[PDB]
Write a protein that binds this DNA or RNA. Structure first.
Ligand SMILES: [Mg+2]
Ligand SMILES: [Mg+2]
Ligand SMILES: [Mg+2]
Ligand SMILES: [Mg+2]
Ligand SMILES: [Mg+2]
Ligand SMILES: [Mg+2]
Ligand SMILES: [Mg+2]
Lengths: 187, 147, 134, 174
RNA sequence: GUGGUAAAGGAUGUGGCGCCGCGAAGACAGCCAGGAGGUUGGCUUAGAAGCAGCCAUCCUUUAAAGAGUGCGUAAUAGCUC
């Protein structure tokens, strides 16, 4: 995705937030720069972008920049963006989460059960060229008690993982109900 | 060139029945004549084997009834090859049986002239389809195919 | 629980740590006013949710009572009150993520957390997932 | 979606005169003054009357539509005339005309007597029917309502004074 | 008559901002025709036949009708979206 971005300076952060202009910082191991973008555009973008799908920032210089959101500070009391750190990529391998799509319903949910998708993404080290939009997961043999670790995984072509292999990607959990309260009323 | 007053839906075996409820209150206070009415009703069930045929009744203005024999219930066709007299209490986690779609095909040929559904390629999934709410799945071979 | 004995009151300042983000589940319930949620109210809202949909998904409770409520037997002024008449309470500052839900559709979760909102001494606020992770 | 901007048809031949805050509608059956809010614009065009609102704020819309409808009902009133019909459903129940006045036997200890107001005509066709006629719409409606109120329809029997075509919903008992 | 001094919570109050869906290939509204077939869904149940509850994922006549929104009845048909 692409998005308009402007250069920042000694202007009041608070006043800029008043103007709806969300503050930000574009940087890598070489660059470090104060910037600011528009909030309304940042919303419609981030709803579909997030840290996963890469974004390209625009500048008055005409420079397009292969950025990536590393973190976004949030203000308390009704969730809302405060500030945004942009990681301008390069070409060398660099860590970032990648989404997941648990295709096919498990055995547990069918016979009454709930999918407790632990990880909605997986942190893997990868080159700026390899950007898998989603990694399929053949979850189906799972019952309301079994689980899927990072061990068994649709590991992408030429893409290693950074997180520990024993890390639990997902699991299935029992459906609680009113009949549970019967025992809960006793003990 | 025919009269009507109150359509009514009663289920009873093709050859054996009695004025007992719910067939009773259906034609007890409405007044029925089991002298010539059943003497034409038993005829349409004489050669036909046993079932739970839902003869779609439609009580005339002259206290008669339309004994047009419609095809047996959807529940009746699936539990045929299984030997069951019922089905799964909760069709989701449970499954009393699992007949193939091969039994589904040829038994659906006795559930089509009364149906307005055209071909059997559409009539089979009507049988195997209601079965998924009954407590029984299927396994076939041709299906989608494509190219 | 274990700890040791009763505990002071202490004023709840600004919603500093009283503010998070949906970790588990789809939708979520969030606060807007500072409050001491009793150990009764939590179970009241939980049982309200499980009462709404039966054999539903799974309910989370990202808050927990551990602050000893005190109380005197309606008398004068001898020492601190033994209390626990309300038992324990949970300090919740505006925006703190409280109750999560999953495995249920929009209307189920919406209506459920809506019911949970009235079983509470706070003005509540239901929230989706948005996209803002970590 | 806008009743007020829909022009009012004018039958031949009823004279319509605009006035500050009022409008006179003269016609073959009588005359009718209609109160108009001073804010509005009443326009007497060829064979048609129109209404224009000062602005598109809430009050002015709500006055626009009401104005148009009132004047329109005046126009229909002076020419075609309004008349509602009332049914009497009951065993000992009956109606009969005496002078201009109407007499009812609604099962009370005394026969009811209702007098016609100015610009109102009672009519008794069948003994169990009463046609109220007149030029004023709201006056006729009010008169019919008042005659009806003498004995409202029962909640358990077909017993009372009904509007013409009024659906008779009834509750069981024992 | 707010102002002239109370909260949870509620409402087609009024004005302002924005996002989403439908619309000149003719919509929403009111108005004329159908609203259905095996079906009376499986199962529980004295009765459960679109209509106490438990459980869920068929097709076809067709320009159109959700194995079904509520009311009605012992169960029906109905009213209609
Ligand atoms: Mg970590
Ligand atoms: Mg414990
Ligand atoms: Mg203090
Ligand atoms: Mg004292
Ligand atoms: Mg409340
Ligand atoms: Mg007398
Ligand atoms: Mg309020």
């Amino acid at each position: 995705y692409r998005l308009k971005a402007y250069y920042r300076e000694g202007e009041k952060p608070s006043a800029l937030r008043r103007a709806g202009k969300l503050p930000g910082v574009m940087y890598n191991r070489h660059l470090n720069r104060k910037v600011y973008v528009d909030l309304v555009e940042f919303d419609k973008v981030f709803r579909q972008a997030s840290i996963h799908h890469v974004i390209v920032l625009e500048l008055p210089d005409g420079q397009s920049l292969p950025t990536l959101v590393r973190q976004v500070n949030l203000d308390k009391r009704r969730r809302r963006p405060e500030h945004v750190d942009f990681f301008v990529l390069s070409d060398e391998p660099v860590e970032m989460y990648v989404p997941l799509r648990f295709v096919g319903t498990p055995a547990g949910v069918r016979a009454g059960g709930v999918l407790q998708e632990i990880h909605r993404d997986i942190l893997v080290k990868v080159s700026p060229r390899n950007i898998p939009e989603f990694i399929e997961v053949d979850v189906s043999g799972l019952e309301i008690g079994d689980s899927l670790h990072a061990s068994d995984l649709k590991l992408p072509p030429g893409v290693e993982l950074a997180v520990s292999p024993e890390e639990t990607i997902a699991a299935v959990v029992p459906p609680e109900d009113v009949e549970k309260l019967a025992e809960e009323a006793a003990a | 060139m025919k009269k009507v007053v109150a359509v009514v839906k009663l289920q009873l075996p093709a050859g054996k029945a009695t004025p007992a409820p719910p067939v009773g209150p259906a034609l007890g206070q409405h007044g029925a004549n089991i002298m010539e009415f059943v003497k034409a009703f038993n005829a349409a069930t004489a050669n036909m084997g046993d079932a739970i045929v839902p003869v779609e009744i439609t009580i005339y203005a002259d206290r008669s009834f339309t004994f047009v024999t419609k095809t047996p219930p959807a529940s009746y066709l699936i539990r045929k090859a299984a030997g069951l007299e019922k089905g799964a209490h909760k069709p989701g986690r449970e499954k009393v049986g699992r007949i193939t779609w091969e039994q589904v095909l040829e038994i659906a040929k006795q559930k089509m002239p009364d149906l307005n559904t055209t071909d059997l390629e559409a009539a089979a999934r009507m049988i195997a389809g209601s079965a998924r709410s009954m407590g029984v799945e299927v396994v076939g071979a041709p299906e989608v195919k494509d190219a | 629980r274990m700890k040791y004995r009763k505990q002071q009151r202490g004023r709840l300042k600004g919603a500093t740590k009283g503010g998070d983000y949906v970790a588990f589940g789809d939708f979520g319930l969030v606060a807007l006013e500072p409050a001491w949620i009793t150990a009764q109210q939590i179970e009241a809202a939980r049982v309200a949710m499980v009462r709404h949909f039966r054999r539903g998904g799974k309910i989370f409770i990202r808050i927990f009572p551990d602050k000893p409520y005190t109380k005197k037997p309606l008398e004068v002024r001898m020492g601190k009150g033994k209390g626990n008449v309300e038992g324990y309470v949970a300090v919740v500052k505006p925006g703190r993520v409280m109750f999560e839900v999953a495995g249920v559709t929009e209307e189920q979760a919406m209506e459920a957390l809506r019911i949970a909102g009235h079983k509470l001494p706070i003005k509540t606020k239901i929230v989706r997932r948005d996209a803002y992770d970590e | 979606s806008r009743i007020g901007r829909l022009p009012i048809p004018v039958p031949k031949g009823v004279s319509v005169e605009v006035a500050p805050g009022r409008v006179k509608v003269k016609g073959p059956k009588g005359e009718l003054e209609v109160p108009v809010s001073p804010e509005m614009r009443v326009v007497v065009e060829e064979g048609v009357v129109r209404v224009e609102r000062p602005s598109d704020e809430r009050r002015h819309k709500s006055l626009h539509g009401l104005t148009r409808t009132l004047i329109a009902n005046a126009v229909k009133g002076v020419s075609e005339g309004y008349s509602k019909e009332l049914l009497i459903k009951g065993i000992g129940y009956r109606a009969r005309l005496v002078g201009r006045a109407l007499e009812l036997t609604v099962g009370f200890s005394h026969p009811v007597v209702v007098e016609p107001p100015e610009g109102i005509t009672f009519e008794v066709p069948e003994p169990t029917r009463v046609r109220v006629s007149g030029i004023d719409k709201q006056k006729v409606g009010q008169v019919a309502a008042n005659i009806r109120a003498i004995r409202k329809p029962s909640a358990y029997h077909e017993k009372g004074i009904y509007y013409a075509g009024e659906p008779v919903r009834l509750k069981p008992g024992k």
